[PDB]
């Protein structure tokens, strides 16, 4: 069930990708914040490894 749902979301998201980079939406903002987080988390993970 989960795999089917993810595939559906991926294809629908692909079909409307051009509309997304027009942006000027709350969802576009959320994506910019998400990029900032992931980077910090991965750096902290590497330091913990060492």
């Amino acid at each position: 069930k989960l795999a089917l749902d993810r595939m559906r979301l991926s294809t629908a998201l692909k079909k409307n990708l051009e509309k997304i980079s027009r942006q000027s939406s709350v969802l576009m903002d959320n994506m910019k914040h998400l990029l900032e987080l992931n980077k910090l988390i991965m750096k902290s993970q590497q330091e913990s490894w060492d």
Binding site: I41, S44, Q45, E47, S48
Partner: protein, 50 residues
């Protein structure tokens, strides 16, 4: 936030364990020397000192 807290605790634990290891190495050297010295180191003789 949780990852940051984990990293801080890891650093503090690291310094503390380093100090403990140093002290324990000193103690081990002392024990080795003492056992070596003791290993390197009857009625008639006892009656003599009295």
């Amino acid at each position: 936030s949780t990852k940051e807290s984990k990293n801080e605790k890891l650093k503090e634990d690291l310094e503390r364990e380093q100090r403990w290891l140093d002290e324990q190495q000193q103690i081990m050297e002392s024990l080795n020397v003492l056992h070596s010295e003791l290993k390197n180191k009857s009625e008639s003789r006892i009656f003599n000192e009295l």
